[PDB]
Amino acid sequence: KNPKSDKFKVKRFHHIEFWCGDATNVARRFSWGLGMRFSAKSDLSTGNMVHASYLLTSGDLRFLFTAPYSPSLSAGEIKPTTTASIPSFDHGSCRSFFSSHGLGVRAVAIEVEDAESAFSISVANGAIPSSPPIVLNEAVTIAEVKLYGDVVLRYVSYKAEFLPGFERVEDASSFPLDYGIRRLDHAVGNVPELGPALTYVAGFTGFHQFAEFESGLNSAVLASNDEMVLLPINEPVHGTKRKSQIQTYLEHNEGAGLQHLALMSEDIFRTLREMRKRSSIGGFDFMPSPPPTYYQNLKKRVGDVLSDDQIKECEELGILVDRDDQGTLLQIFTKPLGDRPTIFIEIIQRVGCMMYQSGGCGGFGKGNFSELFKSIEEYEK
Amino acid sequence: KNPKSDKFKVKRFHHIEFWCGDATNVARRFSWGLGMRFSAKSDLSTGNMVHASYLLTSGDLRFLFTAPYSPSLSAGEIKPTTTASIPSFDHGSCRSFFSSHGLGVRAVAIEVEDAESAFSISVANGAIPSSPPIVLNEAVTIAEVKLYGDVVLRYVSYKAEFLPGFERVEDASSFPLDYGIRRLDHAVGNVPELGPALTYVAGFTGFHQFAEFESGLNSAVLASNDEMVLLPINEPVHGTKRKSQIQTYLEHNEGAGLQHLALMSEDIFRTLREMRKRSSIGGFDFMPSPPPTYYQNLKKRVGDVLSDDQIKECEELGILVDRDDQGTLLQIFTKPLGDRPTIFIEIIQRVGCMMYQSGGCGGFGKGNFSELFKSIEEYEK
Ligand SMILES: [C]C1=[C]C([C])=C2[C](C3=[C][C]=C(O[C]C4=[C]N([C][C]N5C(=O)C6=C([C]=[C]C(C(=O)[C]7C(=O)[C][C][C]=C7[O])=C6[C])N([C])C5=O)N=N4)[C]=[C]3)C3=C([C])[C]=C([C])N3[B](F)(F)N12
Numbered sequence: 001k002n003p004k005s006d007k008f009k010v011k012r013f014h015h016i017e018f019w020c021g022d023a024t025n026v027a028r029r030f031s032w033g034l035g036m037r038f039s040a041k042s043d044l045s046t047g048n049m050v051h052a053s054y055l056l057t058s059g060d061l062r063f064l065f066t067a068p069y070s071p072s073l074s075a076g077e078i079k080p081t082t083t084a085s086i087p088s089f090d091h092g093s094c095r096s097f098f099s100s101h102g103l104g105v106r107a108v109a110i111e112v113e114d115a116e117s118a119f120s121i122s123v124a125n126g127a128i129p130s131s132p133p134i135v136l137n138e139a140v141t142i143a144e145v146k147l148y149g150d151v152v153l154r155y156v157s158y159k160a161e162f163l164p165g166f167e168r169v170e171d172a173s174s175f176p177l178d179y180g181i182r183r184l185d186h187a188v189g190n191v192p193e194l195g196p197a198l199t200y201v202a203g204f205t206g207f208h209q210f211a212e213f214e215s216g217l218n219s220a221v222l223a224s225n226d227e228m229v230l231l232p233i234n235e236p237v238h239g240t241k242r243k244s245q246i247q248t249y250l251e252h253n254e255g256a257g258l259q260h261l262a263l264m265s266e267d268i269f270r271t272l273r274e275m276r277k278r279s280s281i282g283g284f285d286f287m288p289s290p291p292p293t294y295y296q297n298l299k300k301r302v303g304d305v306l307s308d309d310q311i312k313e314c315e316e317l318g319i320l321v322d323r324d325d326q327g328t329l330l331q332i333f334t335k336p337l338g339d340r341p342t343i344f345i346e347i348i349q350r351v352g353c354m355m356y357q358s359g360g361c362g363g364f365g366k367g368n369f370s371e372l373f374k375s376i377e378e379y380e381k
Numbered sequence: 382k383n384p385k386s387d388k389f390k391v392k393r394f395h396h397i398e399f400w401c402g403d404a405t406n407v408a409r410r411f412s413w414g415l416g417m418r419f420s421a422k423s424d425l426s427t428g429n430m431v432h433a434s435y436l437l438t439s440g441d442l443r444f445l446f447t448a449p450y451s452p453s454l455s456a457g458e459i460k461p462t463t464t465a466s467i468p469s470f471d472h473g474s475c476r477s478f479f480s481s482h483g484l485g486v487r488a489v490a491i492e493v494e495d496a497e498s499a500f501s502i503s504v505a506n507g508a509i510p511s512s513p514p515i516v517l518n519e520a521v522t523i524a525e526v527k528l529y530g531d532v533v534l535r536y537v538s539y540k541a542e543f544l545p546g547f548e549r550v551e552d553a554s555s556f557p558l559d560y561g562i563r564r565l566d567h568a569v570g571n572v573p574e575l576g577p578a579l580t581y582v583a584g585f586t587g588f589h590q591f592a593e594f595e596s597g598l599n600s601a602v603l604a605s606n607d608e609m610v611l612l613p614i615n616e617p618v619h620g621t622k623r624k625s626q627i628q629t630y631l632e633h634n635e636g637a638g639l640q641h642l643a644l645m646s647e648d649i650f651r652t653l654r655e656m657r658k659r660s661s662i663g664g665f666d667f668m669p670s671p672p673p674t675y676y677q678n679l680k681k682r683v684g685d686v687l688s689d690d691q692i693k694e695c696e697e698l699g700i701l702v703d704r705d706d707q708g709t710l711l712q713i714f715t716k717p718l719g720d721r722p723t724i725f726i727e728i729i730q731r732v733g734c735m736m737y738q739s740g741g742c743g744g745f746g747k748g749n750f751s752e753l754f755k756s757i758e759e760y761e762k
Pocket residue numbers: 186188219220232233234242245260262287288289290333346364365366368369372376
């Protein structure tokens with residue numbers, strides 16, 4: 001049941017911003033590993049004396065990578081005279097974030113009808129302000145409120161090409177990589193306490209709980225009116241013999257933060273073939289594949305949705321499959337994106353729920369916890 | 382003239398250590414961009430709760446990438462009980478270095494006969510101590526003294542496989558990339574004042590000035606007994622209409638530091654073909670190529686050393702050529718390795734001076750400054 005209670009008009013996920021120590025090296029690694037093109041830049045070459053920011057795109061997916069320059073380059077500037085293209089940026093905030101958390105997501109950005117109104121309504125409804133609305137070149141309005149930990153929910157609204165002050169990059173420097181990723185499906189946070197996190201975020205957005213159906217976690221999913229902006233949140237479950245990966249996350253991250261980004265592929269088999277080709281030559285590694293037992297049990301579950309060929313393809317790529325009462329979900333998880341066992345990526349493809357495809361079709365793979373335990377003891381039989 | 386005045390026995394360059402915010406992403410970028418294999422690791426998976434360190438190798442070239450974990454992971458440890466594999470590592474030092482300089486070289490490591498003696502003799506002769514000698518697993522001794530800025534000269538000595546506590550990496554995770562790079566030829570520092578820098582380093586090493594033959598710099602080269610460890614140092618020249626790139630370096634780096642690493646290739650044409658193939662897909666970019674004028678003038682200079690084919694190959698790859706009275710130097714420069722206009726890489730190949738090849742054969746490309754200015758005004762003719 002969807003009460004459609006959004007307190008302001010939300011459109012879609014707009015971009016994700018990583019705070020880095022060196023934006024160049026992270027962006028180049030991610031571009032090769034995920035098949036994303038260099039699309040826009042804001043840095044010294046565009047007059048930005050404050051931060052280096054590079055945008056990667058694949059389909060509608062936008063990854064922004066930002067790092068601070070020496071504060072000395074901009075020490076004569078004041079906020080009215082800043083050369084930063086993202087005026088919410090702060091040298092001290094960024095260094096504090098990165099020294100505390102390592103490489104991770106600073107901003108989950110969603111497009112809204114009116115960022116100034118979204119900010120005002122959010123703060124009026126309990127949101128903790130992070131950066132007030134600012135109009136960029138009379139063209140774009142950006143505002144930020146706290147989401148969890150040091151992650152912000154960033155509102156972006158356009159009167160009418162990423163942000164003012166960003167330049168499109170030279171097509172020679174812009175190689176058209178594409179492994180099939182097309183958009184951000186959902187963004188997942190880890191918190192110490194799920195209840196208060198849910199109460200806070202649902203409180204200021206009006207996002208509603210999304211319909212679901214011990215593995216170390218409890219979780220719930222907050223969703224916008226059309227359920228296209230999806231924000232799952234996890235908490236740890238303690239004293240389980242096998243230590244909760246949520247707890248491990250919280251310790252290595254120094255607290256709450258973004259756990260993973262799920263990226264929708266238009267063809268998950270092509271995406272995984274292309275990413276796995278590059279795992280050992282600069283790209284991303286994947287979690288260990290489930291045993292052949294798991295795939296020997298997939299016929300009895302989704303044999304009506306995937307052929308015997310497409311299930312064999314799942315086995316060679318290590319893809320997981322789960323199923324709602326409305327659709328089917330193909331998913332796989334990368335190993336952590338950086339030094340710490342914190343942030344990772346999920347690749348997904350959803351099958352079903354056509355009207356366009358409705359949001360969250362197939363769920364989020366909850367059933368794959370117990371099926372993994374089943375396949376583990378069935379493999380040792 | 383070589384007085385062979387080394388105050389202790391120096392062997393060869395051993396490794397270069399980068400201090401990073403995220404060692405994983407920098408190492409993966411560098412591996413793909415330069416064709417270096419993942420060789421050894423020291424990180425959480427090997428019991429290191431202090432820093433993540435990944436070693437890349439190509440031939441005898443060793444690049445180490447290190448970043449700190451949360452200090453909270455090791456807060457119960459003391460130096461006698463540390464899990465760091467490089468006991469000179471300090472969380473505060475590393476964060477201070479990276480916040481001050483961005484991505485850059487922390488350690489220039491050379492192998493010596495006896496690291497404890499090299500440290501003692503160096504400090505007795507004016508070297509500023511950075512980390513005292515420590516014996517690792519009764520097997521390797523490591524000690525550090527200040528070189529310039531926050532760069533240290535690291536002494537490594539073996540009684541008898543990188544360092545104790547480092548594990549060889551899984552061959553599956555270890556793809557045998559190789560673009561032909563084989564060793565570190567020299568490592569170049571930028572300082573505000575060349576004289577006092579030279580007096581200091583030559584003072585504690587006994588390194589001698591290496592034989593040479595306004596572009597914004599003055600420079601000199603310090604060399605070990607057999608001139609295989611080579612350490613050029615630059616200072617800016619001020620008031621030149623065109624601002625000194627050394628000065629620009631010092632401003633963006635927040636002072637003195639390592640400017641570039643020159644990596645010897647066994648086949649610079651293959652290396653540049655392979656690196657340029659990857660420039661736009663995660664690798665490294667190269668400085669703008671010299672005009673065809675420069676190459677039209679190369680016949681009259683090195684037409685006795687390179688064929689008309691090999692000179693055409695230089696033109697398509699943008700390779701520069703210079704010549705001593707003893708040998709010939711092929712060289713090219715990358716764009717900066719990270720966000721800041723600070724550190725970059727040079728690829729080189731030396732032709733001549735065979736006895737083995739003697740160090741510094743062909744010089745360091747000083748003549749390529751004036752020849753570049755000549756080719757610029759000759760191209761506009
Ligand atoms: C620590 C640990 C966890 C598990 C499962 C094991 C187990 C093992 C089994 C398979 C394996 O490789 C495959 C793999 C391992 N992961 C990593 C863990 N994970 C997930 O994070 C996961 C997930 C399903 C959905 C999602 C989401 O999207 C979420 C949510 O959940 C909340 C709601 C909203 C969202 O959006 C997420 C994050 N599912 C199935 C999962 O398994 N992902 N794929 C690696 C290890 C094991 C055996 C047999 C023996 C040992 C010693 N271990 B062992 F202790 F290492 N171990």
